[PDB]
Design a protein around this nucleic acid. Sequence first.
RNA 1: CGGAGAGGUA
DNA 2: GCGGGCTATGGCGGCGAATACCCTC
DNA 3: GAGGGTATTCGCCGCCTACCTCTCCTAGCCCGC
Lengths: 49, 122, 49, 195
Amino acid sequence: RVVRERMTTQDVEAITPQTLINIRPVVAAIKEFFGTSQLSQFMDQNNPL
Amino acid sequence: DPAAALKAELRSKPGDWYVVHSYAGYENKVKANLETRVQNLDVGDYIFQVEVPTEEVTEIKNGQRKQVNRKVLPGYILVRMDLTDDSWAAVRNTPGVTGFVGATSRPSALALDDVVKFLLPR
Amino acid sequence: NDLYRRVINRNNRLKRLIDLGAPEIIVNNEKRMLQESVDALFDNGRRGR
Amino acid sequence: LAAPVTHIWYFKGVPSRLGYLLDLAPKDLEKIIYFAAYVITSVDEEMRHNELSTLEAEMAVERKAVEDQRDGELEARAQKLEADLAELEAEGAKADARRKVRDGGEREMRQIRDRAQRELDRLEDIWSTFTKLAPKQLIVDENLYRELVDRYGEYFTGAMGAESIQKLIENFDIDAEAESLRDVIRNGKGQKKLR
RNA sequence: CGGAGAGGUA
DNA sequence: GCGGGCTATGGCGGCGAATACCCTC
DNA sequence: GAGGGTATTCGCCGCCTACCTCTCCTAGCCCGC
């Protein structure tokens, strides 16, 4: 959505792949999953089993 | 009188001024994308002008006077246009936009007196 | 405190807009937002999102 | 608060303890409170009843004048049609262009008649509103309310928002309403009595 | 030490 | 250019009231 | 149409107690120095 938005509000012949891509949403969703999910569970290490 | 002069100027120009709602500081970006979509999407027949009525408040902060480009009516967009779903798309589907500020149910146009009042440099 | 801040923000917004003068449409929209803010403060989620 | 605000407990909590008090449907409160419709806080009756006949005469004059203007427009359109017929019969134009111009002219005449009917029905709607305007009535379509107030600024007062409901509560006696509900209960009966 | 989530004991 | 502050559809039962569909005047 | 009598649908309310352990509690962006 961000890249489509920025695809219309920046002049041509100055756009490059690196100036349209904002990683933030992806690196944020990954952390959201690995910190604040019901399935990313603190591992049970009472005993090897 | 600047008021009468701008009244006469805006009498002839096509399109009835309308109002749209934005998200706080996301206003100038809204007008940017709006008239850019006017240039690109081929809807120049609808949006004849986009204005963010804003008088820059030079206030004494941090020990010195500093201007704040507050949008007189914060969060609101004055856009001259016609009854067209295309302009609705180009604005309400633009970034930092919430919807058209209708009077009762559907979008309503500011009276020329108010738009002349708010488009006059303060 | 967050909801109190929402209500106070909208109240000050609507106060400034009336004091400085504004078209009845904008003032009505701001009053609607103030109404929604107060409704959220007293009972959040009862009406709308 | 810079503006009046309703308390959601007595508006949204089922049963709406504002709808029962004011005898308004919950949708009506949803609209009036959230600035989606105007409401007639009150309508003057004596200033209406005394001037009813005079305003009926004034509306008759107004409708006659508007109809005369429309008939003049139709006469101008008929003159245009006569000019078209003269042009057709002047030079050689066979059935193709004849039918083209005649269809154009009859379409213009139908457009004029549609404008006539729409204006007449607008005035009829205005008068129907005026002869039915009572407190606790929602006037949607801001354009209609604007026409009503511009043509008749007095004879009534309509507001919108929480302050309108505050006004309704102020102009609302509790004894007469209680007497009316008690009468509906003891006498009458039915779904009326249940409500 | 207030919220959300997860796991667990009776 | 970097730091800080401000804003933004796998529940289920009971119950009632806010509301579809049809006969009557 | 108004009106009433029936249904029909949707919103809301309710869903044992007590206790132990752990991990996260914003993100984007716009203005200032």
